[PDB]
């Protein structure tokens, strides 16, 4: 397997505006098929990249900055990854979703607002070429990625991911590590052929002859871990505090991260922004689309090589030689200047300072059926994507969503537009629920850990539990979506429209 820690971590460049005034910031990003070297010992890999880059450029904006991005498709008219036509017009459809973005609905990147090359053909929900991001939301790590109907797992795996950072000037006084000491880490697992080409399975292993070919798979686990588009890279760091914006940009894989020298992370932020208080952690779980905004303090580790380690298996136990490793820090870079940064305890308001009335309690089941080929089809509340919309919260109102998970695995449930609070998790009797539809708890409710006391947008719903979250639906009304962010689940068919109504 590929020799670990021989390539330096790329730092994606920050995208520069095409035009900028006090009133408006304008960016252009074109999707291009490109070549990139994923590891020292590999031939260059053919990939799809925002502006021909993998990951795409990092976009940095201020809170309330009035941003527009024209996302353009200049990709080949045929895909290079295996398309299964039985699960769902031009072959290559794309649309860019700003994950966590508080956007009008027609700039949100709806799966059916897709477009082919040069916008020649567009889906039924397409309205605009230029997307508008008013950024009227908390400072946070967002990320952008393809969201095209029935193609998301493929377009994302192909390379269409990037970081998008909202900076709230009100947080600047906290003196968190900044600029060169504030580094996105987009973590993507991949399987890569000897010739350097991406491998994505064309079918489950040992397919029943009943299966079509290609066939969608229910889960994808890559053999190799990349950070910022390089396989098992190293980052030379100065002996001081760094802020890392850790993004799970993987299709299926969940990580459980730790430092092999036993050092701590200081978590300062979750998907929806700064936590009310910093949380010292020795390890953390990170499912697809979750973000952890953390400080690592290397002050006391000069000279050391520290492995960012992973203990979470994907389809099997973690392998010490391969997926147990993410990247390596080498604390050998000379100090550019005095560490003027801080790791404060007091960060932001508690979400609980809000006293919203509960308009509605919405009960939602994670379930599944079997198609004519014998394949599992994962469904939210036993509905298909195309069934009439049922999740219709009223704009400006707060609901509790009670998410019932009787399946065998965790699903990272994601709502577009909003961030939300986590109320609790409670174990229930799965057999009894499956037999009778009755919910019988086998234990008391468990409130969220401090890491989940802030704002979340993608939340792990574990097997045999009811997860409750509270979300205020706004500030916009319109047509959005909610879904499992395991892309293989999302595409078949664990995704539903969400109408925020007026
Ligand atoms: O996908 O959010
Ligand atoms: Cu997303
Ligand atoms: Cu989203
Ligand atoms: Cu799922
Ligand atoms: Cu989504
Ligand atoms: O989102």
Curated annotation (Swiss-Prot):
| Traits of the deletion mutant | Disruption of the gene does not prevent spore formation, but mutant is blocked in the appearance of the brown pigment characteristic of colonies of wild-type sporulating cells.
Site (Plays a crucial role in the protonation steps) residue list: 108, 490
Molecular function terms from GO: copper ion binding; oxidoreductase activity
* Consequence of substituting residue 138 to K: 357-fold decrease in catalytic efficiency with ABTS as substrate. 152-fold decrease in catalytic efficiency with SGZ as substrate
The cofactor note reads: Binds 4 copper ions per subunit. The 4 copper centers adopt structures classified as type 1, type 2 and type 3.
Question: What cofactors does this protein use?
Answer: Cu(2+)
Q: What do we know about this protein's activity with respect to temperature? A: Highly thermostable. Optimum temperature is 45 degrees Celsius for SGZ oxidation. Optimum temperature is 75 degrees Celsius with ABTS as substrate.
Please report the name of this protein according to its UniProt entry: Laccase
Induction description = Expression is switched on about four to five hours after the onset of sporulation, a time that corresponds approximately to the stage of spore coat synthesis and deposition.
Q: Where does Cu cation 1 bind?
A: 97, 414
User: What is the main EC category here?
Assistant: oxidoreductase
Q: Which GO BP terms apply?
A: sporulation resulting in formation of a cellular spore
From which source organism is this entry? Bacillus subtilis (strain 168)
Q: How does it associate, per the subunit comment? A: Monomer.
